[PDB]
């Protein structure tokens, strides 16, 4: 199912024609061309091969382009039609299972999902470091997850209205209300994928940094993000908002790709995790807690968010089912 | 993944709050109460159990409600809550793998997908007739697939607008043009899910009927639908449009559920299969051929459509995969020619 989806040219097209994504990667690579010139490159999950082409433009001597879907066949076609057979070598397969003939100077990939970690492709990216030379680099080099409390009564009421379907004592004569609790729980486990006005954010964001040069694959099985927010506005906190930046830390310059709500909307949007019960906080209070992401079998995460207003002891404990997001953007 | 999807209350709710589903089924069952009163019922893929509750409202003695996803746990909670444990038995599992303690008088289900057959659940519905008494009934009893040729130049030219992304010699310095043919082929292989104005239809529909009381499970592995269309309008034929009706043929009356474009829009919409090579036909011409649906491993079908204009010999041959439909519906009022 997963690699079947990526076998479609339409999905590769959709990612490629996203200019912030494609254009930022090309700038990161070309403006750091000394990190590529005459070097050996591994492209993890190359799709059409676009990043491998950028590495070749920047003067890479040899690029191993690993792709697990049938899109590998299409990448091979483009390498031949662009006369790059001596420079880009497609290796069909999962990066965990293929054989490479030598170690590489730099690994490149676009492994980011919703909230950075969704899809769990960063595990494959970090796995690939078995091929990285000791002096070696990775593009992207780091990822910063940002979280901030938000207020959005409308979104809270939207989701509660849907759940309240299961409150009905006589839906076509049938009592559904035994499932009231189960339904509220399920709906509030859905992360909400869309954008929002920055004025709904009630505190400055807290940053959690993953350094891909240092992180191990296994580390992403359990991700613990501590936070302490200094509330800038009084009101109800309906949940936490999440976004991410990645940096390409090259030898010439650092280039950033941001999905922040202060930046042009991207196809990652932003993600919000709702509280079943909103918390009241006053400006000046502190909202503290821990976001715990636990990896599961569906290439996703079970998220635990516990947040408390320190001054009052008002606490919210919450689950998020990242397998089952609500795509709200209209 | 398939049964995991159905374990969400939100998904089941989406189908329950669809009134053309839930309302039509309730009417079909309650208006045919003599088909259910003191009878034994099998509910195939019951989800929340809603149809089983309707069978009980109609006075069924015993309902075996079979559900393969974890929604069966929630159905059990509802059966208890509604004090019907003596009359509805929730059996967790696939209808192909469970055991019933007796044969049943009637089987009820909502197994319809896009173009009727998508999702392949009708095979489970027909499989369940191993439990049906000799003269038992099935609700739905019959399904009618309708097909008609259409003209839609704008839909046709969208496929090339999208594919021609690849016809660029320097997309960020890369020549993409070698993949344009593959892209065209992929887009044309996607059946288009959306609605349309009936005035784009160029001939009266042809109807293919499956009688679920007589059909066998294997009949649905290879479905051959011949057609001969007598053109009412002159123009370019860009493909075939598909929709379906099912009938609940009770002892008291027949109730229809229709997804036709002459009827209020449903969540099945309609489905259009484009010809990558469109056919010129004039009013009075005959457009003949064959739509072959070949079951595949992804709970879907490979679709082969071959059509020719008899008077000119002009021919169009097309392969689609119903596992990769394009959901085109936006909401904007459909345009006539
Ligand atoms: C509506 O249209 C849609 C289109 C696409 C999507 C999914 C979007 N997902 C992402 O953006 C993720 N970041 C993954 C991106 C990369 C491809 N990156 C290529 C790229 C880079 C820069 C600019 C443009 C494009 C996936 C490839 O990774 C492959 N892959 C994943 N895991 C592995 C693995 N372990 N080994 C090998 N290949 C793998 C997978 O088959 C693929 O082909 C959703 C909707
Ligand atoms: C955006 O929201 C969405 C929500 C749902 C969908 C999928 C739509 N599919 C259909 O409508 C198909 N007709 C299948 C409907 C039936 C349920 N019918 C319940 C009903 C009946 C009348 C009125 C309202 C509701 C599926 C159950 O069938 C189960 N099932 C499928 N195959 C089997 C099987 N072999 N054995 C047992 N259960 C099975 C499956 O687990 C399920 O729970 C897509 C999008």
UniProtKB/Swiss-Prot annotation, chain B:
The gene is CARM1. One of its GO terms (molecular function) is beta-catenin binding. Residues 199-232 are annotated as: Required for nuclear translocation. Changing residue 80 to A: Loss of FBXO9-mediated ubiquitination and subsequent proteasomal degradation. This is Histone-arginine methyltransferase CARM1. Overexpressed in prostate adenocarcinomas and high-grade prostatic intraepithelial neoplasia. Belongs to the class I-like SAM-binding methyltransferase superfamily. Protein arginine N-methyltransferase family. Methylates (mono- and asymmetric dimethylation) the guanidino nitrogens of arginyl residues in several proteins involved in DNA packaging, transcription regulation, pre-mRNA splicing, and mRNA stability. Recruited to promoters upon gene activation together with histone acetyltransferases from EP300/P300 and p160 families, methylates histone H3 at 'Arg-17' (H3R17me), forming mainly asymmetric dimethylarginine (H3R17me2a), leading to activation of transcription via chromatin remodeling. Methylation of H3R17 (H3R17me) by CARM1 is stimulated by preacetylation of H3 'Lys-18' (H3K18ac) H3 'Lys-23' (H3K23ac) by EP300 and blocked by citrullination of H3 'Arg-17' (H3R17ci) by PADI4. Its EC number is 2.1.1.319. Changing residue 21 to A: Loss of protein methyltransferase activity without affecting ability to regulate replication fork progression. It comes from the Eukaryota. Its main location: nucleus. Keywords: Acetylation, Chromatin regulator, Chromosome, Cytoplasm, Host-virus interaction, Isopeptide bond, Methylation, Methyltransferase, Nucleus, Phosphoprotein, S-adenosyl-L-methionine, Transcription, Transcription regulation, Transferase, Ubl conjugation. The keyword 4Fe-4S does not apply. One of its GO terms (cellular component) is nucleus. S-adenosyl-L-methionine binds at residues 12, 21, 45, 67, 96, 124. Homodimer. Interacts with NR1H4. Interacts with SNRPC. Interacts with the C-terminus of NCOA2/GRIP1, NCO3/ACTR and NCOA1/SRC1. Part of a complex consisting of CARM1, EP300/P300 and NCOA2/GRIP1. Interacts with FLII, TP53, myogenic factor MEF2, EP300/P300, TRIM24, CREBBP and CTNNB1. Interacts with RELA. Identified in a complex containing CARM1, TRIM24 and NCOA2/GRIP1. Interacts with NCOA3/SRC3. Interacts with SKP2. Interacts (via PH domain-like fold) with C9orf72. Interacts with PARP1; promoting PARP1 recruimtent to replication forks. The keyword Cell division does not apply. It is found in: Nucleus; Cytoplasm; Chromosome. Methylation enhances transcription coactivator activity. Methylation is required for its role in the regulation of pre-mRNA alternative splicing. It catalyses: L-arginyl-[protein] + 2 S-adenosyl-L-methionine = N(omega),N(omega)-dimethyl-L-arginyl-[protein] + 2 S-adenosyl-L-homocysteine + 2 H(+). Residues 1-306 form the SAM-dependent MTase PRMT-type domain. The chain holds residues 148 to 484 of 608 of the full protein. The modification Phosphoserine is found at residue 69. There is a cross-link at residue 80 (Glycyl lysine isopeptide (Lys-Gly) (interchain with G-Cter in ubiquitin)).
